[PDB]
């Protein structure tokens, strides 16, 4: 039967193209993820329908009820059968459902509009008329609350109490702000999003210093499925093939505005 | 009872100690691997024998006698429990033993002799005065055999006919040839090495050009062990507090020597 798969509106991995309107199914979108489900589906020969997440968030635990909630949760209670996006494996997402090897290896970044005085996590862990936020519900958000290493944990001292909130709920509010904040919001996010975003106009923005962290996206499927094995295989196979770094060439450089 | 952990002699990864001789079992090593196993083990709670693969290999299926050799073999027949070393992950490897998610992330990359004028791998195929090669059974040499792209499938056309051999059947084997060779020999090795004898004296060899691939290097169980589980969730665990980019300073910064 067919494959629900479960993905999240993110460029450059999932968009919906110019004439989406006057297209169905599958093909209203394009993009990186939209590029790798294909070359997967056809390397494990199934059919597959691509699903945008309802709450649009990648997933975190609810400490209260304990439910999981955006992609993850798709996953973790049955309403999708495997999870094509840029999502980040992590412990506490390994724990409830499986993701293959690594398709995409990055680190969590700074993102500052051209010209603010900052350079490096510990800049901005020594000021306070710039501030800096994270993406709600994912792994970046999870990284500061649970660092122990002093310039993080004072960032995030900074970040969980400031007010109004620093937090966004997608990576494009994110960006918004930091070009709309005179270079007063700084923005941490994943460096494969900070590269793209750095590649198109207006161009005003820059990733500055070296990532904070070395992680991947790997596609998650259920505990216990039947296509973990497999789709595992199929991206070791892609990444050998070149595919992988043919696809990030297409969707980063070689669209490019800037 | 006690896990057979079986590694290689690989600096920074796993060395003898100066003293070694009045030493006893695990002791007699130290390395980025040495501490690696101790916290895995610690994290996962089991007792282990450090053992230095036989063959000082990393491993690779012989064409016609179909078996395995180095830490892959030690594990597919037995003879190991688990194999912690910079072991890079593999489609073929992953078809017959389990590997965790990446304690390291990593590519090929090119050492020159300073002074050499190289600056990519196109530089290399498009010249013959310069010679190059990799090491012998591994994931390096296999990717130039399997790869596709022009460039990578010309150099391995020169490499595999070339003769005296360019290969080497160890890493140290290969700088060596780099710093006798005055600029004639270029060595295709992971840029986690290239990096770190970049840091050591003579600081006579450069790491240039990007990376060739990108890929990651994982802990691996053999099929079906009942360490695998634990093991996975240990690697993850231990990156997110931030001990494998602590480990990584030690041994490649903390210790250099230029
Ligand atoms: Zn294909
Ligand atoms: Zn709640
Ligand atoms: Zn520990």
């Given amino acids: 039967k067919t494959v629900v798969v479960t993905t999240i509106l993110e460029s450059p991995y999932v968009m919906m193209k110019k004439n989406h309107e006057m297209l169905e ?4 979108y394009e993009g990186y993820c939209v590029d790798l ?3 997967i589906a056809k390397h494990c ?5 691509l699903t945008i997440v309802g709450d649009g968030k990648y997933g975190a635990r609810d400490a209260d009820t304990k439910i999981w909630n955006g992609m993850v949760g798709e996953l973790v209670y049955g309403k ?24 995409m290896s990055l680190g969590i970044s700074i993102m ?15 000021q306070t008329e710039i501030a800096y936020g ?3 519900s994912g792994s970046t958000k999870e990284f500061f609350r649970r660092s122990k290493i002093a310039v993080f944990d004072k960032m995030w001292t900074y970040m969980r109490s ?7 709920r997608t990576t494009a509010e994110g960006v918004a702000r930091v070009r709309k904040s005179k270079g007063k919001y700084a923005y941490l996010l994943e460096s494969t999003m900070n590269e793209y975003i750095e590649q198109r106009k207006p161009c005003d923005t820059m990733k500055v210093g070296g990532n904070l962290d070395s992680k991947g996206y790997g596609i998650a499927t259920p505990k216990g499925s039947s296509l973990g094995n497999a789709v595992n ?11 992988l770094d043919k696809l990030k060439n297409k969707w980063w450089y070689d669209k490019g505005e800037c």
């Fill in 25 to 28: 199914g599958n093909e209203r």
């Fill in 37 to 39: 489900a294909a070359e």
């Fill in 45 to 49: 020969g199934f059919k597959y329908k």
């Fill in 80 to 103: 999708a059968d495997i999870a094509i996006a840029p999502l980040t494996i992590t412990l506490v997402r390994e724990e409830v459902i499986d993701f293959s090897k690594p398709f």
């Fill in 112 to 126: 500052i509009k051209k010209g603010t005085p900052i350079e490096s996590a510990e800049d901005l862990s020594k």
């Fill in 134 to 136: 994270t993406l709600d």
């Fill in 162 to 168: 400031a007010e109004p909130s620093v937090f966004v």
């Fill in 233 to 243: 295989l199929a991206v070791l196979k892609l990444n050998e093939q070149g595919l």
